[PDB]
Design an enzyme around this catalytic site. Structure first.
Site, PDB file in Angstrom:
ATOM      1  CB  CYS B 109      13.502 -35.911  59.292  1.00  0.00           C
ATOM      2  SG  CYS B 109      15.380 -35.483  59.099  1.00  0.00           S
ATOM      3  NE  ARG B 112      12.948 -40.119  60.261  1.00  0.00           N
ATOM      4  CZ  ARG B 112      12.252 -40.994  60.440  1.00  0.00           C
ATOM      5  NH1 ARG B 112      12.142 -41.282  61.244  1.00  0.00           N
ATOM      6  NH2 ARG B 112      12.826 -41.594  59.004  1.00  0.00           N
ATOM      7  CD1 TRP B 281      23.737 -32.452  56.475  1.00  0.00           C
ATOM      8  CD2 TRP B 281      24.762 -31.657  58.195  1.00  0.00           C
ATOM      9  NE1 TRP B 281      23.712 -33.498  56.385  1.00  0.00           N
ATOM     10  CE2 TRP B 281      24.362 -32.818  57.699  1.00  0.00           C
ATOM     11  CE3 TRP B 281      25.219 -31.124  58.930  1.00  0.00           C
ATOM     12  CZ2 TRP B 281      24.909 -34.094  58.599  1.00  0.00           C
ATOM     13  CZ3 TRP B 281      25.165 -32.585  59.480  1.00  0.00           C
ATOM     14  CH2 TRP B 281      25.063 -33.241  59.865  1.00  0.00           C
ATOM     15  CD  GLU B 286      16.653 -30.692  52.389  1.00  0.00           C
ATOM     16  OE1 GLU B 286      17.170 -30.996  52.104  1.00  0.00           O
ATOM     17  OE2 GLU B 286      15.211 -30.043  52.412  1.00  0.00           O
TER      18      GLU B 286
HETATM   19  C1  HEM Z   1      21.271 -33.302  59.653  1.00  0.00           C
HETATM   20  C2  HEM Z   1      20.838 -33.079  58.379  1.00  0.00           C
HETATM   21  C3  HEM Z   1      19.485 -33.267  58.020  1.00  0.00           C
HETATM   22  C4  HEM Z   1      19.011 -34.080  56.732  1.00  0.00           C
HETATM   23  C5  HEM Z   1      20.354 -34.452  55.377  1.00  0.00           C
HETATM   24  C6  HEM Z   1      17.349 -33.680  56.653  1.00  0.00           C
HETATM   25  C7  HEM Z   1      17.338 -34.455  55.413  1.00  0.00           C
HETATM   26  C8  HEM Z   1      15.849 -34.058  55.793  1.00  0.00           C
HETATM   27  C9  HEM Z   1      14.548 -33.850  54.576  1.00  0.00           C
HETATM   28  C10 HEM Z   1      15.542 -34.035  52.860  1.00  0.00           C
HETATM   29  C11 HEM Z   1      13.986 -33.842  54.536  1.00  0.00           C
HETATM   30  C12 HEM Z   1      12.452 -33.143  53.722  1.00  0.00           C
HETATM   31  C13 HEM Z   1      11.551 -32.034  53.722  1.00  0.00           C
HETATM   32  C14 HEM Z   1      10.914 -31.554  52.067  1.00  0.00           C
HETATM   33  O1  HEM Z   1      11.426 -32.151  51.330  1.00  0.00           O
HETATM   34  O2  HEM Z   1      11.131 -30.864  52.152  1.00  0.00           O
HETATM   35  C15 HEM Z   1      13.358 -33.428  56.150  1.00  0.00           C
HETATM   36  C16 HEM Z   1      12.429 -33.799  56.480  1.00  0.00           C
HETATM   37  C17 HEM Z   1      12.173 -33.300  57.857  1.00  0.00           C
HETATM   38  N1  HEM Z   1      13.083 -33.357  58.816  1.00  0.00           N
HETATM   39 FE1  HEM Z   1      15.103 -33.234  59.162  1.00  0.00          FE
HETATM   40  N2  HEM Z   1      16.584 -33.290  58.183  1.00  0.00           N
HETATM   41  C18 HEM Z   1      17.864 -32.981  59.072  1.00  0.00           C
HETATM   42  C19 HEM Z   1      18.563 -33.072  60.426  1.00  0.00           C
HETATM   43  C20 HEM Z   1      16.521 -32.377  61.242  1.00  0.00           C
HETATM   44  C21 HEM Z   1      16.454 -31.859  62.003  1.00  0.00           C
HETATM   45  C22 HEM Z   1      17.544 -31.400  62.683  1.00  0.00           C
HETATM   46  C23 HEM Z   1      15.678 -31.872  62.529  1.00  0.00           C
HETATM   47  C24 HEM Z   1      14.406 -31.558  63.658  1.00  0.00           C
HETATM   48  C25 HEM Z   1      15.201 -31.090  64.905  1.00  0.00           C
HETATM   49  C26 HEM Z   1      14.718 -32.854  61.674  1.00  0.00           C
HETATM   50  C27 HEM Z   1      13.358 -33.046  61.605  1.00  0.00           C
HETATM   51  C28 HEM Z   1      12.599 -33.033  60.007  1.00  0.00           C
HETATM   52  C29 HEM Z   1      11.278 -32.867  60.238  1.00  0.00           C
HETATM   53  C30 HEM Z   1      10.401 -32.217  61.624  1.00  0.00           C
HETATM   54  C31 HEM Z   1      11.081 -32.799  59.171  1.00  0.00           C
HETATM   55  C32 HEM Z   1      10.068 -32.642  58.228  1.00  0.00           C
HETATM   56  C33 HEM Z   1       9.339 -32.043  57.367  1.00  0.00           C
HETATM   57  C34 HEM Z   1       7.897 -31.940  56.550  1.00  0.00           C
HETATM   58  O3  HEM Z   1       7.183 -32.006  56.458  1.00  0.00           O
HETATM   59  O4  HEM Z   1       7.455 -30.358  56.293  1.00  0.00           O
HETATM   60  N3  HEM Z   1      15.727 -32.617  60.729  1.00  0.00           N
HETATM   61  N4  HEM Z   1      14.936 -33.693  56.655  1.00  0.00           N
HETATM   62  N1  LIG Z   2       2.453 -27.421  56.101  1.00  0.00           N
HETATM   63  C1  LIG Z   2       3.957 -28.019  55.413  1.00  0.00           C
HETATM   64  C2  LIG Z   2       4.428 -27.930  54.088  1.00  0.00           C
HETATM   65  C3  LIG Z   2       4.052 -29.591  52.826  1.00  0.00           C
HETATM   66  C4  LIG Z   2       5.258 -29.115  52.287  1.00  0.00           C
HETATM   67  C5  LIG Z   2       6.276 -29.151  52.330  1.00  0.00           C
HETATM   68  C6  LIG Z   2       6.529 -28.175  54.013  1.00  0.00           C
HETATM   69  C7  LIG Z   2       8.368 -27.871  53.767  1.00  0.00           C
HETATM   70  N2  LIG Z   2       9.033 -29.148  54.606  1.00  0.00           N
HETATM   71  C8  LIG Z   2      10.013 -27.886  55.203  1.00  0.00           C
HETATM   72  C9  LIG Z   2      11.198 -27.886  54.127  1.00  0.00           C
HETATM   73  C10 LIG Z   2      13.202 -28.162  55.037  1.00  0.00           C
HETATM   74  C11 LIG Z   2      12.922 -27.059  54.493  1.00  0.00           C
HETATM   75  C12 LIG Z   2      14.145 -26.215  55.229  1.00  0.00           C
HETATM   76  N3  LIG Z   2      15.179 -27.476  56.007  1.00  0.00           N
HETATM   77  C13 LIG Z   2      14.393 -28.776  55.841  1.00  0.00           C
HETATM   78  N4  LIG Z   2      14.822 -29.225  57.122  1.00  0.00           N
HETATM   79  C14 LIG Z   2      15.707 -28.886  58.181  1.00  0.00           C
HETATM   80  C15 LIG Z   2      15.853 -30.355  58.277  1.00  0.00           C
HETATM   81  N5  LIG Z   2      15.432 -31.216  57.826  1.00  0.00           N
HETATM   82  C16 LIG Z   2      14.716 -31.051  56.743  1.00  0.00           C
HETATM   83  N6  LIG Z   2      13.132 -28.299  55.643  1.00  0.00           N
HETATM   84  C17 LIG Z   2       5.372 -28.383  54.288  1.00  0.00           C
END
Ligand code: HEM
Ligand SMILES: N#Cc1cccc(CNCCc2ccnc(-n3ccnc3)n2)c1
Ligand code: HEM
Ligand SMILES: N#Cc1cccc(CNCCc2ccnc(-n3ccnc3)n2)c1
Ligand SMILES: C[C@H](O)[C@H](O)[C@H]1CNc2nc(N)[nH]c(=O)c2N1
Ligand SMILES: C[C@H](O)[C@H](O)[C@H]1CNc2nc(N)[nH]c(=O)c2N1
Ligand SMILES: OC[C@@H](O)[C@@H](O)[C@H](O)[C@H](O)CO
Ligand SMILES: OC[C@@H](O)[C@@H](O)[C@H](O)[C@H](O)CO
Ligand SMILES: [Zn+2]
EC number: 1.14.13.39
Lengths: 404, 405
Positions: B109, B112, B281, B286
C-alpha cells in the site's frame, strides 16, 4: 521446490525447474526479500568443479557429451588446474561461454538475440595500447554505419597475484559531466567522477553538454592510459521531434552504441575483468532514464515549458506528457538516422517470446522484473503482468568495483 | 557497516539500514537460491499464545507501558482465556491499535502516510447478514462523506473454533458486474465474471450495462450467503470527462468514488478477522491505468487512441503511452471537478517517500513491495522508482484468503 509462475493477463501457468541449476546465492532469505537492490552487498577444487560443469555445458551444447573429445578436454583442464592452479579456455568455448552469460543475464530485455553475438577474442593483449586497438575495432564492427550488431571483446582473464586488465569507463561511449563553480553540472552528472579522473590523467576537457569521454584503459599493475576515440568512430544521433519543430532547437543528441565496459564476465570459474559488450538501445534507456532522470540530464521541466504545460501542479501530468514526447523524439530521430533501436513495446513483446522459447528449451528463465519492466508505461507492456523468477546461473556477467 | 540490509536511494545517493526486518516472525517466498519477490500470490494453543503474547507486547510498547503491572496482568489474562476457552478477545483499543498497525505493516500500500488516521469501526457484536449489511452501509456513508473521503475499516467477529466464518464474498464493496456474452466477450468488468454469476445464481436480477454496481453477497456463520443491493444514493460515482478532449465525455465512462477491499483477512495476535473491509481513496493510476487499460480489464486503450487519431498499427508511435496519459488525466480532472478525493501517482509517491523517512526514524525501517509501490505508468518519473526497498511480513497483517466458494 519448483516455483509456480503465473501470467495474470492470460491466466497461463509455468513451473521454473531451471532455477535448480543455480549454484550461487542471491540476496534474499525467507525473512526478507532484497530483490529491489541494485548491487550485491559485498581454491582448486572449487575452480575445478566450476570448470568441469562448464566444459560439460559446452559439449552438451554441441551434442557431444561422453565423446572422447569431451573426456579428453576434461582431463586437460584437470591436468592444468592441478599443476598451475588455473586453466585456459579454447576459443570455441569462450564463444559459447559469452553467449550463455548473455542468455543468463536476468536484467537484459534483449535476450531474444542471445544466439547472435560476435565474439572478439582479445586474450592476446599485453598493453593498454593494444586494448585500444581492439576497442576501436569492436566499435567499428558493432556500429556498422547504424545497422548495429551485438558484439563482445574479451580481454585477458584475471590471474593470481597480478593486477587486472580494466577499462575504467563504465561504457565505451559516454558524455562528460563537468562540476561547475556553483555546484551544478554541465553534461552528464552520472559521469562527474570518471570525467575528473580523465582530466587528472591529462585529458584536455571540452565544455559542452555532450562531450564524448576519452577511454582510460589499464594493463596489469600499470597506471591507466588515456585514449581519445576518433570522432568518426562515434556515431551520434541529433534529436528532433516528428511534429514539435522547436524540439530540435534543444540541441539534444545521443550516441548510437550502448556498450557496457565495467562488468566482469565469469566463465567456468575463470574471470574476465575487461570484456566490454554492446547491443542496441531500447528507446526508454535514452528517452526516459538518460534524459529524464532527476540525476541525469533532467530535461522534463524544460520540455514541458516548451510544450506550455502547467508545471505548477502534479495533477496536470506535465511530467508524463513531456516524457512521452521525449521518447517519441528518440524513436523518430534514430529511425530518421537509420540507426538500430527498439521501442519498449516491441522489446517487451520479443522478451515474452524469449520466455516461451526458454521455457521449452531449459525449463525457465532467470528474470529481474524490476529491470525488465520499462520505466514508463509499465503495465501497458506484457512483461508487467508476467511473474518472473530471479536467480544466478553461470556463465554470468557480474558487477565489480570501480578500479580506483 | 551494520548486520542489516543496506538500502540505497540512487537519485539522492542516501543510505539507510533496515533493522525493523529483525522483528519479522513470518517467512516470505524468497530463498538465497531464487527471488520470488515478483509473484502476486506466493504459497493450537501454543502457536496462538506466542502470537498473542507478541501482539500484547506490541500494544504495551506503543502506549509506553512495556514491563508494567497492567502489561503483565493483560498477558496473564490472555493466557487464562486461551487456557479455558482455546481463544481470546481483544480490548477495543487493542483492536484499534492492531488495525492501524496492520495497515502500517502492509508492504503493497502506497497510502501509508495516512496510517495513523484510520477510523476503526467495531462490529464484533454483529450476529447476522442483515446486520452486516447495515454496518457496511454505515461504513460506506461515513467513508464516502459526499466526496470528502475518510479512511475506515469495519471489523466483524473473529474466526471461532467450531463455528463458520463471517465472510463478504465480494472482493470490493463497490465493483461492476461482468456479463459473459454469447460471442465469448465480456460486457462490463472481466475481473468480476465469477462473482457476477454467483450473484445471479443467488437470485440477483442482472443488468446489462458496462457499469452495473454489483449487489453484496454476505455470509454470517454457518449460513448460505444473503444478497443485498446497495441503494444507489450510497454509491457515489464520477462520470469521466477530459479537460481538453471534448469527445472523451461521449465515451460514457465512469468510476466509483470508494475503493473498499472486502475479502482480505485481518490478523492480530493470532486472532483472524475473516471479514474486515477497509477503504481509503484511489490513487488515480488504479482507475486510469489498471481498471480502464489492463488488457484483461476494460481494455479501452485502442478505443481512446482511435478517437485521438493515433497510429495504432505500429508500436513506435507510442499510441498506448499517449492514450494512457490522457485517460489518467481524465480520471484526475473528473474526480477534482466532482470534488471527490483522489491522488495522482506523483503526489502519492512523494508522500510515500515522506512516509519512508518517518518510519525510518520511528521503527528503523518500512516493509515495501517495490513492484507494487512503483506506479504502472511513468515509473521512473516518480521518486519511489529510485528507492531500494526491503520486503518482509510484519504482524498484525492483512492477508489474502481463499474465496469462500
Ligand atoms: C487512504 C488512502 C489510500 C491509498 C491512496 C492507498 C493506496 C493503495 C494502492 C495504490 C494499493 C495497490 C492496490 C492494487 O494495485 O491492487 C494499495 C494496496 C493495499 N492497501 Fe491501501 N491505500 C489507502 C488506504 C488504505 C487503508 C485505509 C488500508 C487498510 C486499513 C489499506 C491497506 C492496503 C492493503 C492491505 C493493500 C494490499 C492489497 C492487495 O494486495 O490486494 N490501504 N493501497
Ligand atoms: N487475492 C488477490 C489479489 C491479487 C491481485 C490484486 C488484488 C486486488 N488488490 C486490491 C485492489 C484494491 C481495490 C480497491 N481498493 C483498494 N484499496 C483500498 C485501500 N487501499 C487499497 N485496493 C487482489
Ligand atoms: C541486442 C540488443 C540488446 C538490447 C535491446 C538490450 C537491452 C537491455 C536493457 C534495456 C537493459 C537494462 C539496462 C539498464 O537500464 O541499465 C540491459 C541490461 C543488460 N544487458 Fe542487454 N541488451 C542488448 C544486448 C546485450 C548484449 C549483447 C549483452 C552481452 C553480451 C547484454 C547483456 C546485458 C547485461 C549483462 C545487462 C545488465 C547490465 C547491468 O546490470 O548494468 N545485452 N539490456
Ligand atoms: N554498477 C552498476 C550499475 C548499476 C546500475 C546501472 C548500471 C548501468 N546499467 C547498464 C547501462 C547500459 C548502458 C549501455 N548499454 C547497456 N546495455 C547494452 C546491452 N545491454 C545493456 N546497458 C551500472
Ligand atoms: C531501486 C531500483 O531497483 C533501481 O532504480 C532500478 C529499478 N529498475 C531498473 N530497471 C532498469 N532497466 N534499469 C535500472 O537501472 C533500474 N534501476
Ligand atoms: C506479475 C506482477 O507481480 C503483477 O502484475 C503485479 C505487479 N505490480 C502491481 N502493483 C500494484 N500496485 N498492483 C498490482 O496488481 C500489481 N500487479
Ligand atoms: O563517474 C563514474 C561513474 O559513471 C561510475 O562510477 C558508475 O556509476 C559505475 O561504474 C557503475 O555504472
Ligand atoms: O469475480 C470473481 C473475482 O472478482 C474474485 O475471484 C477475485 O479475483 C478474488 O476474490 C480476489 O480479488
Ligand atoms: Zn526476493
Amino acid at each position: 521446490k519448483f516455483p509456480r509462475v503465473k501470467n495474470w493477463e492470460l491466466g497461463s501457468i509455468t513451473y521454473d525447474t531451471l532455477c535448480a541449476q543455480s549454484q550461487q546465492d542471491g540476496p534474499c532469505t525467507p525473512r526478507r526479500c532484497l530483490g529491489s537492490l541494485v548491487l550485491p552487498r559485498k581454491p582448486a577444487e572449487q575452480l575445478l568443479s566450476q570448470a568441469r560443469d562448464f566444459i560439460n555445458q559446452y559439449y552438451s551444447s554441441i551434442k557431444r557429451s561422453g565423446s572422447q573429445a569431451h573426456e579428453e578436454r576434461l582431463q586437460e583442464v584437470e591436468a592444468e588446474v592441478a599443476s598451475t592452479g588455473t586453466y585456459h579456455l579454447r576459443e570455441s568455448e569462450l564463444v559459447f561461454g559469452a553467449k550463455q552469460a548473455w542468455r543468463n543475464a536476468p536484467r537484459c530485455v534483449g535476450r531474444i538475440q542471445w544466439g547472435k553475438l560476435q565474439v572478439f577474442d582479445a586474450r592476446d593483449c599485453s598493453s593498454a595500447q593494444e586494448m585500444f586497438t581492439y576497442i576501436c575495432n569492436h566499435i567499428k564492427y558493432a556500429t556498422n554505419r547504424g545497422n548495429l550488431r551485438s558484439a563482445i571483446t574479451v580481454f585477458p582473464q584475471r590471474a593470481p597475484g597480478r593486477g587486472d586488465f580494466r577499462i575504467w569507463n563504465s561504457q565505451l561511449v559516454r558524455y562528460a559531466g563537468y562540476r561547475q563553480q556553483d555546484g551544478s553540472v554541465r553534461g552528464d552528472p552520472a559521469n562527474v567522477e570518471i570525467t575528473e579522473l580523465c582530466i587528472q590523467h591529462g585529458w584536455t576537457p571540452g565544455n559542452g553538454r555532450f562531450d564524448v569521454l576519452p577511454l582510460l584503459l589499464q594493463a596489469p599493475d600499470e597506471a591507466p592510459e588515456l585514449f581519445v576515440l576518433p570522432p568518426e568512430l562515434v556515431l551520434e544521433v541529433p534529436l528532433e521531434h516528428p511534429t514539435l519543430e522547436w524540439f530540435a532547437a534543444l540541441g539534444l543528441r545521443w550516441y548510437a552504441l550502448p556498450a557496457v565496459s565495467n562488468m566482469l564476465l565469469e566463465i567456468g570459474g575463470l574471470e574476465f575483468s575487461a570484456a566490454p559488450f554492446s547491443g542496441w538501445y531500447m528507446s526508454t534507456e535514452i528517452g526516459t532514464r538518460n534524459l529524464c532522470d532527476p540525476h541525469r540530464y533532467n530535461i522534463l521541466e524544460d520540455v514541458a515549458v516548451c510544450m506550455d504545460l502547467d508545471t505548477r501542479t502534479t495533477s496536470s501530468l506535465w511530467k508524463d506528457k513531456a516524457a512521452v514526447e521525449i521518447n517519441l523524439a528518440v524513436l523518430h530521430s534514430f529511425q530518421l538516422a537509420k540507426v538500430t533501436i527498439v521501442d519498449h513495446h516491441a522489446a517487451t513483446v520479443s522478451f515474452m517470446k524469449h520466455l516461451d522459447n526458454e521455457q521449452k528449451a531449459r525449463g525457465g528463465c532467470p528474470a529481474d522484473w524490476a529491470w525488465i519492466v520499462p520505466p514508463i508505461s509499465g503495465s501497458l507492456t506484457p512483461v508487467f503482468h508476467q511473474e518472473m523468477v530471479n536467480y544466478i546461473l553461470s556463465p554470468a556477467f557480474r558487477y565489480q568495483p570501480d578500479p580506483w
